[PDB]
Every structure is written in C-alpha cells, then in structure tokens.
Amino acid sequence: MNIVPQDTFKSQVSTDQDKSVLSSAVPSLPDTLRQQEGGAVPLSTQLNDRHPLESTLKNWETTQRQRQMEQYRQIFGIAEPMKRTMEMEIVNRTDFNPLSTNGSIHRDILLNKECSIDWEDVYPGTMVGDDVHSKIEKQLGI
Amino acid sequence: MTDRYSFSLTTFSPSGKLGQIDYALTAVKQGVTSLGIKATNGVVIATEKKSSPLAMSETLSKVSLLTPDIGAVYSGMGPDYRVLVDKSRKVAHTSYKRIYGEYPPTKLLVSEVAKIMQEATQSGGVRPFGVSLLIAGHDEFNGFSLYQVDPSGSYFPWKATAIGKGSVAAKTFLEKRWNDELELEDAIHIALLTLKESVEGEFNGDTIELAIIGDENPDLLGYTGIPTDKGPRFRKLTSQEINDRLEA
Amino acid sequence: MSGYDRALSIFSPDGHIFQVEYALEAVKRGTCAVGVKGKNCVVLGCERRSTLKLQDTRITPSKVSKIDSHVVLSFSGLNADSRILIEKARVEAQSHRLTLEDPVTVEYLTRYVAGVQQRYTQSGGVRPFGVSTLIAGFDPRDDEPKLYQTEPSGIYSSWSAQTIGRNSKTVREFLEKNYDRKEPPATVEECVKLTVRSLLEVVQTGAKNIEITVVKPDSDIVALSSEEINQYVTQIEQEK
Amino acid sequence: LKKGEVSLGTSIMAVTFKDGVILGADSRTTTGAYIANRVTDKLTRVHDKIWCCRSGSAADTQAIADIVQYHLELYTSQYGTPSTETAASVFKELCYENKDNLTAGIIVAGYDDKNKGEVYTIPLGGSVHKLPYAIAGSGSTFIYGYCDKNFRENMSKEETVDFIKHSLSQAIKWDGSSGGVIRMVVLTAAGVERLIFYPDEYEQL
Amino acid sequence: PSSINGGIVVAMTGKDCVAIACDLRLGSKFEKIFHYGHVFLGITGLATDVTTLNEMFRYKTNLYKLKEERAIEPETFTQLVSSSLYERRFGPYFVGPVVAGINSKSGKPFIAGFDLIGCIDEAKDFIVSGTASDQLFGMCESLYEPNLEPEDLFETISQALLNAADRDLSGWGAVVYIIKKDEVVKRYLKM
Amino acid sequence: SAAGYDRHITIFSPEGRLYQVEYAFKATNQTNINSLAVRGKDCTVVISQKKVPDKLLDPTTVSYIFCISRTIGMVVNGPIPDARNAALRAKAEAAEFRYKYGYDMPCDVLAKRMANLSQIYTQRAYMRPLGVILTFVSVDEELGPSIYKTDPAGYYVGYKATATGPKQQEITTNLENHFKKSKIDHINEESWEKVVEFAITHMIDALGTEFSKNDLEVGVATKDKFFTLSAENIEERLVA
Amino acid sequence: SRRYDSRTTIFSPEGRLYQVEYALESISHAGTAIGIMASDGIVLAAERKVTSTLLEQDTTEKLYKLNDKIAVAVAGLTADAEILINTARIHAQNYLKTYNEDIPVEILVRRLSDIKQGYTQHGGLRPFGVSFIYAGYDDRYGYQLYTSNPSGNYTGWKAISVGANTSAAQTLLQMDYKDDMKVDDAIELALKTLSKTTDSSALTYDRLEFATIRKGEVYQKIFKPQEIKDILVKTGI
Amino acid sequence: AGLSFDNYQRNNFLAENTTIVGVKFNNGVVIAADTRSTQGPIVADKNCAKLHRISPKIWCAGAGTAADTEAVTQLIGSNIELHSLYTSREPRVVSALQMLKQHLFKYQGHIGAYLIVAGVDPTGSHLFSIHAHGSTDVGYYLSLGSGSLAAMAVLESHWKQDLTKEEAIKLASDAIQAGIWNDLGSGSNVDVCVMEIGKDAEYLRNYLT
Amino acid sequence: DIILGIRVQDSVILASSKAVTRGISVLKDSDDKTRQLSPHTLMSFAGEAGDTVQFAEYIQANIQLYSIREDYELSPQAVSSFVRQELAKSIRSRRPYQVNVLIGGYDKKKNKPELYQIDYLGTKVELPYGAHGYSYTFFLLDHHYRPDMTTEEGLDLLKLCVQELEKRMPMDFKGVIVKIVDKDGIRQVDDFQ
Fold it and tell me: Cα(H51)–Cα(A33) distance, rounded to whole angstroms?
C-alpha cells in the first residue's frame, strides 16, 4: 500500500554486482572497456550526490502497479494478482525486437495505457558491444 | 531455461514465401470491400457496413480519423484494425506532435503503421495482423495522398484502389473511370457507382460509410478567434447526405 | 539421428551430441586453411575461391585477420559467423590489455574464443557458430611459436601443423609425410614453401588462389603479395 | 512539510449521536495570512454514508482520499456496502505506510446497519483511535475544554447540531486559520442530510 | 586561448530579410552561429554545451531531411529546439539559443529566443542573447527601426555590435549573416 | 479439424481462419441457455433462462447475471468459470476507469475495453480466448438505454435489442417483426415493470414454452442503479 | 529436409541451414536491380513490379538514400528493407556525431551485414528477406559498390545485379563491362541490360528507377520520370 | 526514458564555483489575462498570449515556471485528445483536472506550474485552481499571479450569483485592468476567452487595448 | 602537473613535466603523463589522481581497437572528437574531476600537424599553442610565435618557456620531457627541453 516509492537505496556493494560486464581476465572485477561509460566512473560515485526525485520517478509506475496488485489480493484473492502477473510475464517474455525499443500494443492494453502519454513515451532514450549478439546473450542468459 | 525464447511463428517455405503473411492476405481477400479514390482537390474513402439487423449501424464505424487531416479504412479483421487505429492515434502524438508541434504528414504516419505491422511478422509471440489499410490524407508540402498498407507492412501510393472481396472488379472499374482532371464530387459519384456493384443487399445511406479529405471545416473546429488555426479536413458524410447523393 | 539430433542438449544412446557433428559438417564445406610453425615463425595459408570477372578485389576482406599486433587468426566454415568471432576476439584482446596492462597470450585468446563458442551451445534458442579457427602467434616477450585449433563445440588443441576445411584430410596426410617435429623448418622460406606445397595438393588453379601470412616474434606480421606466392609456386613446379 | 506547500489549518468535528453521526467543518483555506478560498468544501465523501475530513498536506490527503474511494468501489463490487471500520483501516494503512513521505491526518465518520454510526481519528503518524466524538485542526486546541464539558452520549439530532455549531463558532472566533460558513453532514438510517450555517447566525450564539 | 565561454548573439528582422550576428575572439575558428540549410541558430553560454547542441541539432535535422524529403522550416525547428531543451529538465544546458530564418512557402521572416529549458520568446523586432554587455539591449532598442532594407538592417546591426564592443578590446571581431528568401550573405567585421 | 499447429494456438489456417476462436464460439453454447435484452424509454431489461434439472442444487446460487458497477449490468452466455473470470475483470476495469478519469465508465467504453482484451487473446500464441459472450446493459447519462455485446473474436457492437443462445434466431426474428410493426427502435413504455413483462412475453412466444418464477432471471438497469429481481418480483411480473 | 527446416537454429545432418537458403531463394521473386561502377561515378537502376496504371509512379520502392554519400538499391521484402534502412541512417548519423566525419561505406555495410547475420542465430527471429546493393563514395577508397544478402555475407563488385534475372544480367554485364567506362556509358549499359532481361514487351519509363552518384564535391541524383524518359529516348530504347 | 537527470552533479559543481482571472456566469465561464511578458525588470513582450487551449472548450492560464506550464498543458491536451477519440465523447473538465492533479503529484512539486482551468462540457461549466504540488480547488471566481490581490479585490467588490455574459466579461476585464494598473508585473492589454454552454468558445485577443 | 604544446609548420611539440605525487619520494625516469593513441597521434594529460590515468588508458584502448578493426588510422580531428565525447559522457552522472588534455597529431591525408586542447568540462579548442598548470607564458608565446616556424625555432621557444617556468619554481621541478610528432611518427628529444 505504498504511494511514494520506498526502499530505493542499495544495502550492499561489490565489484562483481553487474554480472553482464564482468571481466574475463579477472572475473571478480568489472570490464571497464565494455562498460563504455567514459572509463572513469567508479561504482562508489553512484552512491552519493543523486537527485532526490530520480528514485521516486524511476520506480513510480512499479510502485503504483504493486499497490494495485495488493488491493486485488485484499479484495479479490490471490488468483487475480496471479493472473495479472502471469499475463504481463507472458507478454513481456515473448517480445524480442533487438532493433526497436518501443513497447508492445498488448502491453499498453494490459497496463490500461492505450490512450495515455507520459514523458517516458515522448523521450524514450558505440565503439564496443552495442550489437544484436549482446542482446541475444543477455536475453538467453548465455 | 527453455522458456526464455519462443520460436518464430512466421517462417519461410521451401519456395521462398512466408506462409502466415499469405494466409493473412487470404483473410483480407475474404473481407468486405473498401475503396479509395484520389482527386485534384480531395480524396474519397468508402466502405460497406456489412452486418445483425438489430445491430445499430452508427455504433460501429469502419472509417476512423487518425489526425484532423488523415483518415483510414480497412478490409479484414475488425479487432486488429481497432488496435492499430488506437496505436496510430497515439503514435501521431508521441513521435510528432509532442516533438515538432505539428501533426505528421500522411506518409510518415503510414510508415509508422507499416513498421508496427511488420514487427508482428518477426515474432515468436504473435501472428501477423489480418488487415489491409487504406489511408488518405493531406499535408502542406505534399498535397493529397492515398496509400495502401498490407499485412506484411508493405505500403504503396495509389491514384485509386480497392481491397476486399470484390477488389478485382472494382479495380477494373476504377481503371476505366479515372482521369487526372477528376474533381472531388466526381470522385464521390464514382465511388458510389463502384460500391453499387459490390453490395448485394440494401444499398442506402445505412449500409455505406463514406469519408472525404477536402477543404478545411471551420464549423468543426469548436472555437473561434484565431485566423491562422486551420479547421479539420477530414469529414465523414452523414446518412442523409449519402441518401441525397444516391437519389440524385 | 533416431530423434536424438534435434537439440544441442540431447545425448545419443551411444553418448554423442549430433548437432555438434553437424556443425563440424558445416565447417567441412568451407575453404581449406593450413597452419605450420617452424623454428622461429608461424605461417598461415588459405585457399581462396577464384575471383569473378566483375568482382572488386581492392577491399575484399582477407582470410587471415589480425586479432592483435602479435596474434593472427584464420578460419574455415561460415564466413559471416567468423566476423562476429573476430570482433569479439579483438574486443577481448583490448579489454585484457586495459585490465592487466599486458597483452594476451596466444593460449589465453584461444581459450576465450573456445569459451565463446562453448557458450553458444548452451541454449536451445541459439545456433552454434559453424566455424573452426586457427590461432597463431607469439607470447609477449617470448620467442616460442604458438599454433592452436578451435572447434564449434568449444574444444581447442595445440598443433605443430594442422589443416581445416574442405579436402583437409589430403593436406593433413601430406603434412604428416613431409613434416618432422624434431627438425622443423629452420627458416621462414622453408616454412612458406612447405605451406604452399601443402596447399597446392587441393588448389586447382594455383598461385592466384593461395594466401600466405607469416608471423615472427616481436609483433612482426607480414602478408605476402601475389608475386612472392607466384615465385614460390614456380620454384616448386620447376623442382617437381 | 514540503516547502511552499498548501496546508490545512481547519476546524474539524465529528460527533456520534442516538440516530447516527454528524461531521462538521469550517470553510477557510489560507496561504500564510492570505485567505485563498473562503467557501471551500472540506467534507469529503468516500462512500455513500462514509465521509471524512482531512488535515496536513492538501495534496497528500487528496491523493489518499482518491485511493480510498477507489478501494471502496472495488470492495463494493464484491461484498456490498463496507463498514466504517474497513474504511478507517484502509486510511490507516495508507497513512502509516507512507508517513515518512506524506503528511496526512484523517477524521472518518460513517454509518451502517450493524454498528449504527462510528467515528475514527487518524492523527499524524498513522495511529488509529475510535472515539464517541473527535476534534482536529489548528482551531481544535481552543475548544478542548468546552467539548469535554458539553458532550453527552445518545444526544438527539438537534442537540448534536447545536453542540457542533457552538464548538465550531468558538473555534472560528479564536483561530485565524478558521472562518467562513459551517458545513455539516448528518448520516443516519434515513439517509444523508447536508446543512450550512452562515456567520451572521453562529456569531450571535 | 581556450576560454571561449560567453559571447553575445543579436537577431533582427527587416523587410523580407533577417540579420543574425555574433562576436568572435580573433588575433593570433570557434563560431557560435550554425545553419541547417536555411535556418540559423546562435548559441551563447558554456562552450561545451554549445558544441553538444550543434551536434545534436545537426543529427536531428539530417534525419528530418532524410525522412520528410524536404528541409526544415524555422517554426518547426523552433519547436524541435524547445522540446529538446525541455528533455533535460533537471540537468539543463547552460545556453541561450536564438533562431532566425525565412519561411520558404510564405516568405515571412522569423526570429525567436529560448531560455535554458526551452521556453519560447517569439519577437517581432529583435532578440539579444548573452551577458557580456548590459547596454547592448539599450543600444539595440535605440538603433532598431521596423521594416528596414537589407543594407540598412546590416548597417544598424553592425553599428550596434561596434558600439557594444567599444563599450567593453583587441582581437574582437564579429560575424554577420544577412538572410533573404534566396540569398544569404556572410560578412566579417574586424572593427 | 484445424489440421496443424492451429489445433492448439491461434494462428492463420491456409484458408485464413483462426480455428481456436471458432471453437471458443462453439463453447459459448455449452450451457444451452438463451438470454434476451431490450430497451425501454428510460430502462434496460435483461432476461436469462434458468435450467436447474438437478434436485440437489441450490437454485439461489445459480445465476449468469452480474453487477459490474453501480449502473452497469452484465449477462454471460457460456460456462460459469469463464463467466466469473470475465465478471471480476470487468469490475476491476470499471473501478480503474472511475479512478483514472474522474467519471463513471460508460457501457460502450467498457465493452470496447473487454473487446481489446479479447483481441490480445486472439493474437497471442500462449493465451487462449475465453469461451463466453458478454452483454453489457445500462442507462448511460449521455446515450440513454444501452445494450452492447462482445464475443471471443474481439468484436463488439451495440444493439437496439439482442438475443443470445441456441434459439437466438427465432427470438431475433420475433424482435425484428415487432420492431417493423412498431417502427421504433425501443419499447414505448414508462415503467420498467411493463418492459419486463413485455420481454417475458416475447421470450415465451419465441421459445414456445411457458416459464415459471424459478425458470428465469431478470435484471433491470435504470439511470440510478442496476438491480436484479428476486423470485417474488418475477412471480409478480408473471401475473399480468 | 522437413525435419530440419522448421527452425533457424538447427543444422541439417549435412551442415546446411534451410531457413537461410529459403530466404536466399525468396530474393529471386523480386524486381531486378543493377549497380555499375565507372571511373567517375556509380549508376543504380531498378525495375518496378508494377501491374496497374493506378499506381502513383511520380511519388521510391527500390532506391533510398542512406546519406548524402551513400544510397542503396533494394531487392526483396519492402518492410524489412525499410527497417534496415532506418537503422543504417541512424548508424551513419551516430558516426558523424561521434567522429565529426562521414562514415566509410564498408563500415556501414559491415554493420548491416552483422545485424542480418545475427537475425539468423536466434530461434525467435527469422532472417531478413532482402538484398541490398550499396553505392557510395568515401575518402579512403573512392567509389564503392557492395552487395549484401539475407545470410549476412557481403561482397564488393564493379558491376553487379540482384533479383529475378541475375544470371542473364550478369552474363550481359560480363560481356559488355569495361574498366575505363564512363558514367553515360554505364547508364546506357544498365538500361540495355534491363531492356534485354525484362519479361515485359517494352521497357517504359514508369517501370524504372534510376540514380547516379557523381561529382560536379559528390552529388546524388535520383532521376525523375521525365529524366528517365529523356534518357530512354537518347539511348534508343 | 523521461526527463533526464544527466549533468545534475556537473551543474551543482558549476554553481558551487501577471494577472489571471476566472469568472463563472449563469450559462458558462470566462477566463482573462494580461499580455505583458517580462524577463526580470525588462519588458520582453508587450503582446503575449497567456490563455492556452487544452481542448476546444477547455482553456487554462498558468504562472510559475513558464516552460513547465506550457509543457504540462500540452501533455494534458494530447492525453485529452486521445481519450476523447477513444471514448468518442466530448472531453470533460473533471478528466483534465484528474490528469493534471495526478501528473503534478507524481513529480512532488518539482514541476512549477500553477493553473486556472475553465471549461464547458456536456455536464456544464467548470472552474478550477491547480497547485504545483497536486492540490486542486473549485470556485466561482479565481485569481492568480503577482497581480492576483488587486484582481481579487475587484472580484469581491462586484460579484453576484445572477451574472449575464456581458456582466461577467466586464467584471473579468475590470479585474485584469486593476492588476494592470496597480501591479508592475502586468500592464499592456487584456485577453479574454468566453466558454458558453451549447456554443463554440469565443477567443477575444486584445479585448481591451 | 603542467603540460605545454606548440604546433609548428611541420610538426607538434608536446612537453610534460616529469613530476610525482606528494608525500612519497620516488626515483624514476619515465613520462607517466603521456599516452600514444596512434603512431601519429599523441595525448598528454594533467589533473588529479588516477581518474585521469584511467580515462587516458580507456581512450588508448578504444583507439587501438579501432585501428585493429579497420586496419586504418583515425585522423587527429576524429580522435579529438571521440575524446571530447567520452570526457563529456564520463561526468554526466558524477561530480566532475580536474582533467586537461592536449592532443597532438600529424594528419597524412592533409599532410599537416594539428593540435587540440580539451578541458575538464569537455570543451575542445583547436589552437596553435596551449598550456595548462601554470599560474606569464602566454605573452612569450604571443610575441615569439609564427605559423611557419620550423621545429628548431619551436624548440627554442619551448626552451624559453621552460626557463620562464623554472625561474619561479623550486628545485623540486626536476625537468620536462619533450616529444615531437611529425610525418615520421612520434620521437623523444633525449637531449633537453
């Protein structure tokens, strides 16, 4: 029954927290070349000096959806949130368009956003590793 | 981890054809006829409102306004068309209106719809859409335009065309009845004549749906005071107007 | 077959994975590649299909690709998959150089390529690379030639002389008859001549369908021109 | 709590009586010393016979009330008319789970066939308390004694109306953030009755 | 030599023509005015943000021309600049942009200015951007006259720039663009 | 027979059809129950046949009429589990519309929303369509009495009057004849009791059988509320 | 073959990929396109698959501009080609933004070919059924002509044809092409090859698309129907 | 996606080193504003249109951060147009109010837009005030801006329940004129928009000059 | 850390102080504040602790990857543009760090030397001469610089600048390592400044 997103801060850190960009030479350390972030961005700098509204904006829709699911569980039972989550998982799982970033029509229908526009829709948005094969590897988990 | 992927629902046949696209085209060919005619000062889009006798015809409309200057019609499966129309209306704002402050030209919106339809063939989760669309519009730098979009996502511009069950005969009639000096009223009359040969039952204003892209309509703007605010160019003819044109 | 060859994750009743064998069959259809290491150099030779009359030859990619200033790579099989593998290998070489300040060894790069190929056999939704690779070079601050072979299944091995691709059995037999490990070719010229003579056993037209690349210590990679290969072929024919 | 945010300096009362419940409030909304709205309606309806008044941040309380009304519509679609206790529990959960980010206090007045009129108060923090009568707002501090001396159980409708009118007139008299007209809602088995009293009437009490 | 932050941009409208001018550090290459076919943009403020905005707008205008198969008009470019600036609501660029041009179909001159988050100020007379001189606005107000010929407009804007430069010296120069429906003239001022 | 992968999933047959959708349509007639919906001047009436042959059942728990919101009622043709699934979904949709847009959801908009969900089911391979037909009735504040129908194909449309079930053709023909006689699209009555009696009489004439108080369910939508009549109300209506 | 052609990620016992072969076979059903590189320019020609006179010939189905230096001719499915064309335009603009220089032709070709190869290695994706003829100019190699197919392979050419009549067109080009050819001679050769290889009775202007990349800088010219008619009259066809 | 937070730390490091009224009358609503646009003490524009159109019969006027006001108004207008197309019905003022309130509450007051929204729909005439943090209020007459106190004084002087269209227009014009004369933020002209039930909206640019 | 650079008619001369961190006494003979991006493009950097070295090594790795992939060498202009983009990217989500880079190269397509300077915010300026870390050498450069100066005259001007710098610094300033980029590549002036 949350309105503003909560529990947004990270509780533990490690040098191998980002599993997708781990170095092959030293698996305990990240691969800075394939990160393509400019080469001078330690993870610790991401723990301080953040805009206070960024976490609220990034997790707003998920928080509203979780509150809706909790209300369904309280009023309708377990089956209703179970079915909503199952439908959303099925739709999101079988969509794989490496050349596009726009969401599916069916996802918008499920989210009741058929005729709704937010700034995420208006503003939806290298040398190394920005190709189809990286997306294939991330999708398949290989 | 066999649930992290789904194999493609659309694949090539040994002859080199995508079967699902061909079957969607077959489903399009089994639908009600819809036609479009491009004139010098407007475009006409027409369809037959085939239906139960107890169903209210005005509740369901096969002609939809996409932008104040762009409308569309379809042949095939209605729900797919409804979903695509909602998406096209949203995309006209997300990609163009909120960026340039203007509505998109006809060709770019047609391209967006075509891309959405194409993405349904490179999928392991959905089958391709089973509709063919006729999109008519007007824009400042390109004038009047008429396009046809197929289930594969291919689109082409036409001077006049027809899709659906009676597409071949309607195309023959339009080929024999089209010239580059045609006017909007002449196009409306030709569209009525072409639809006359296709409708089997009652042929009146309650079984025909007509829309035009012509001059601006200040009376449909809803407000007055700004001279540079152009009125909508899309206009759907009423049943009374269709009856009056048929009687004459 | 017998219903045991429709997935990568199926063992045959006799303990085989048939899709790996089929990827090897795909490799067998590519042009032949040969690798021979001498006392102080490694030579990679490649068969090239005869160029068409209207085909531009200025910018056509070579069969031997430089992974790094000290490591080169040749392939046999599907040409398009080799580009992906080569790009990944180059990225890995630069990444290792950035992470440890030291350039990769030949064995390390071979292991990385084999690891990528192995990873692309661990899912039912992906296709393995139909490519077999030969990786040659010298370790940094070292003078011992290194030659390795990698297979689509992810297995790699070390060879004194090896052949892959179409008609590689005949070239392998020729090498086995005409190569001695305890007395390798002591000069670059002898190694190049042996490689060219091995390639001439299956190459129809001759000099114009042979590519030769020579790697020496201290990051010395040379791609021989058509004139030198033609001279080697003419000398071999005269001595024949 | 937020900088440059609209606050609710109101006077809120809810009294249980023999036939049901009555909820009363003033009609003043101010920004510092300036009166932004002198005829605002503070009696919020979340169900046909479940009403509330809000204190604290105006935006936070409005969002919470909208979510509660949506929740009660969902509940009604399943099990019919909810009880006042259920609405109070939903209000309490929303206020308590978000007390680190939202500033909200709610007085809830309800009627139902089983419990026959109830009052709940949820002050800042998110705790819930069931009371025969409740007062809240910046102007409530000035009428703590008077109410304690003039409340009786099972009063008639007219006596409850008079008690609320007198108490809110004193609260308006002494609190600068309170003023305007007095608005009341009477919830009984007969239905919902709205009442309004003007300054020229209650200032002569 | 590496300090190029700041500067001024002046845009004015004449009769069937516009003028856009900017200051330049000369002596012993970095211009703050760019064009995208027939729309001119002058950006004052942080130099890195100026370069970033120029690159982004070149990207977007090239894509726009490839898609629409026609060059972009000043009004559409103004709306695009506004939306792009508003995208960075909480991390905005430290820039003041000015747009000038002539609409091809209508022939009407157009100038506009922006704040750092894209609020549009469409002016019929002139736009001044930058904080180098506070009296530059006053000099432009005292010198501007409506409906000037291209030669008169060029003289007026050049005189305004020269007087502003004299107000605040060695190595200063100016770049002036006079834009008509079909002719664009670029001139340098070393005074 | 679908004769292919269409035996399980919703893909195009060579004829261009979706067999799973048609089979869901066939499933809609499992209960062997007919329903009728008519419009008055300021009310809408739905009547559903009730069949309880088993003596061990409790009749009061047998119903295919649901209250979706304050003003919207729904009648379902098809199996009761899918009917209850659809009822819960419709209730959630109506409440969410009210929360998001600030006013009560119209009947036609809700019908369109359910039709869009059905379109999702028709297009997605791993989602099956529900084998039910839904009929929403209300008195909309802008359109007056309203009847709308949605089917497993995702098609929805409004009606002056409607009938659904195995014997729907005869009821529809009788309705068409009556409307042709009256030359109006609605029933010219001022009280919903008279409309209920007329609809009962129409159902009796169309089906050719007599109905008691326990053989029917009646729902009435007015501008204030939608409510379901009890056994006593139906028994009172029968006596006329 | 029916047991090894239902999915794109399975090898046959002989090591073949049947879906890729079917995608290659689908190219033969497209209209013919020809690219000819002369000593001072590049000529692209194509034949439309038009069957009716109601088509808007004046207002773009075979020839597209990737950027001011690079254009393409398309043979195959139009929508997949449009997807890839938008991707290529975005990549070229990204390279220009990053390096402040125009992208070399080979880099763009290799990027598109890598994308098409990747679309043959995921079970949820089918291959793109398109073939591209790239015509471009860069400061490294000058004028360049490339071809890419659904398998993701690309090749460099002097004169090349794709589509329905590739064999006969290639034979004619081999019998006629010369290294020192000029732009006008290349135009005439392309037109004559199209006329000879056409299955129609006549090679009219409304069934043709033409483009030239030349120098005055480097200029791209997409011929209008009137210019196509003028060149057809000049050649003698 | 959405509004970006990039260069927030960089900007912090670099830093370390109008009269608007709305009046209800017996058959509709009126909104009015001044036309002076300033950048500090300098008058940037003497003829600026501050009345914006959410929908053909729903208009609004804002204060605060100008870019935020314009962007929020345009986004809500796009949402309203899409919703009207989806429902095939005339948009309602309540729906626009709900969208604006929830959007502003999502950003926790960081979008500095304060609005007066007037409109006519099939349910009647409506007038609302909207605060940046998400609170909304209803009223018969409202004022906003730096000149809102003088305009509110005039409105409190001459407002009554039975107001005709002409009386409402005159009252709104007088309130804007008082803000023009007594406030340095206003002063140039008066723009009016009249929305009457059952008729088209009437936009009067420079009603008083 | 102080860096200087002068572009003379046919080459670019880059001078970097062989300084050391504070608190630890080190005996070393190397140029630790300069990375060879390409055989005809050199980069010198100055600023704070290992952030700058990480950035320089990242840039070098990217450029070497490009050179291997294309079998071709990027022009100095493209290299400078890429460096500017990466520097702007690296501080989009963190507090900016002090860094200043001079990129000197010899373009063989144009057959001319080029010199660029990028500051900590990502501002790229093409200059005939530049410096960073000095609290004036600007006047000495202005008075004694000509576009058509030879390598020897540029070295003499650099020596004058070094003397001016050393006249106001302690003996802890060990010296400056000088490198020259021209048509034959990159070489080190082992004699003096």
Answer: 52
- Specify the number of domains making up chain B: 1
What is the domain range of residue D61? 7-205
Chain I contact set for C94 (CB, 8 A): 61-62, 64-65, 68
How far off is chain A from F228, nearest CA to CA, in Å? 22
The reply to whether D186 falls in a domain is yes
For G25, the domain range is 1-237
Q: How far is A116 from chain F (nearest CA, A)?
A: 11
Facing C119 at nearest CB: one of A32, A129, A142: A142
How far apart (Å, rounded) are the C-alpha atoms in residues D193 and D179?
A: 22
G25 closest CB neighbour out of B6, B16, B121: B16
D85: CATH: 3.60.20.10
* The total number of structural domains that make up chain G: 1
Architecture of domain H18-209: 4-Layer Sandwich (3.60)
Active-site annotation holds for D10: yes
Question: In this structure, what CATH number is given to the domain that contains residue G68?
Answer: 3.60.20.10
Question: Cα separation of F40 and I156, whole Å?
Answer: 105
Residue D2 maps to a domain: no
- CATH number of this structure's domain F4-240, picked from the four choices 3.30.1330.60, 3.60.20.10, 3.30.390.30, 3.40.800.20: 3.60.20.10
Do H and D touch (≥3 CB pairs < 8 Å)? yes
**Resolution for this experimental structure (Å):** 2.1
Handedness of CA G7, G10, G16, G20 (dihedral sign): positive
Q: Which helix (H) or strand (E) holds I114?
A: strand I112-118
- The count of CB pairs under 8 A between chains B and H is 38
The encoded tokens of residue D159 equal 């006596």
Task: Provide the residue ranges of all domains of chain F, joining segments of one domain with +.
Answer: 4-240
CB of D4 within 8 Å of a chain H CB? The answer is yes
Q: What is the CA radius of gyration of chain F?
A: 18
**Residue H45 carries which side chain, given as an amino acid letter?**
D
| Whole-number Å distance between alpha carbons of I86 and E174 | 32
Residues A50-54: contacts with CB within 8 Å, 24+ apart? A50/H8, A51/E90, A51/H5, A51/H8, A53/E90, A53/H107, A53/H108, A53/H110, A54/H5
Closest by Cβ to B86, choosing from A100, A115, A141: A115
Mutation test of the interface with chain B: which of H51, H59, H120, H200, choosing the one with the most B Cβ atoms within 10 A? H200
Domains of chain C: 3-240 (3.60.20.10)
CATH number at residue B126: 3.60.20.10
- Structural domain span for residue B81: 1-248
Query: DSSP assignment of chain G, as one string?
Result: -TTSSS-TT---TTS--HHHHHHHHHGGGSPPEEEEEETTEEEEEEE-----TTB-S----SEEEEETTEEEEEEE-HHHHHHHHHHHHHHHHHHHHHHSSPPPHHHHHHHHHHHHHHTTSBTT-PPP-EEEEEEEEETTTEEEEEEE-TTS-EEEBSEEEESTTHHHHHHHHHHH--TT--HHHHHHHHHHHHHHH-SSS---GGGEEEEEEEE--EEEEE--HHHHHHHHHHHT-
The position carrying tokens 């797919």 is B80
Residues linked to residue G158 through DSSP beta bridges, in sequence order: none
Q: How many domains does chain D have?
A: 1
CA D113, D114, D118: angle at the middle one, nearest 5? 90
Alpha-carbon distance of F113 to A113, in angstroms, equals 11
In this complex, do B55 and F158 lie within 8 Å of one another by their Cβ atoms? yes
Any idea where the domains of chain H sit in the sequence? 18-209
CATH 3.20.20.140 matches E1-191 = no
Integer Cα distance of I51 and I65 in angstroms: 21
D and G interact (at least 3 Cβ pairs within 8 A): no
Min Cα–Cα distance to chain C from A108, Å: 27
